[PDB]
Structure 1
């Protein structure tokens, strides 16, 4: 089974991300944080496998960059509306596990977790721009 921490400043978004993982039997939800400070302080005392999170919780890159330095066991899925590869190229340079897009994240968010379980990244369709480059 997998142990997922959801992290976003909107409650309904947390409700959404959670309810999309509800029907999945092999996924157990272990936390719902509405600010980085709470998440950071409960990250040592939670044994978790995946952090689903938005960038806003520039500032999100710093958060991720910190979490990578001190919690490398944990893998991170990043939600984002922006498909601007300028952003998403820099996101992948941090060496995160996956990127769902908020537009139809509910659907693809299960499939990202499934890829992560098998040691496979979830890089979306717009990677063709990074591969063209």
Structure 2
């Protein structure tokens, strides 16, 4: 029932909105917030996270962003579920990442409403993908 989530975005107001929304959901606990994928990857093993909710465009020299970062996480944290926050519904972008077998895609600007629904889907072992 309880789900521990990490949220990662290089915009502090995105993290604020997401935390405010998730604080309304009894069974979701935010166990970390990051703005850089190096900090993320460095601290990931230390947090008993179930789901990573992440932007694909953050700073991170060591491990990268986008597809490169996803590949890194899938290999090194293979049971960590991943929800991608996307700035748009670009057909090509989605494809690349959906092929990697991530669990969810949410339009970033709708995250406070849509994340709770994506996380409920995940809890049922189902994927969530924008309309």
Per-residue CA deviations over 1:108-129 (Å, capped at 9, x if unaligned) read 11000010011001022xxxxx
How many residues get paired? 125
Per-residue CA deviations over 1:44-93 (Å, capped at 9, x if unaligned) read 11111011111101932111110000101210100112211111011101
Asked if 1 retains the 8 angstrom alpha-carbon contact of 2:37 and 2:65, the reply is no
TM, length-normalised to structure 1: 0.89
* Unpaired segments ≥5 residues, structure 2: 59-63
Q: Distance in 2 between matches of 1:118 and 1:49?
A: 14
Asked if 1 retains the 8 angstrom alpha-carbon contact of 2:104 and 2:127, the reply is yes
* Structure 1 moving runs of 4+ over 6 Å: none
Deviation at 1:9, TM superposition (A): 1.0
* Root mean square deviation of aligned Cα: 1.8
2:75 is equivalent to residue 74 of structure 1: no
Secondary structure of 2:98's counterpart equals helix
**Which residue is 2:5 aligned to?**
4
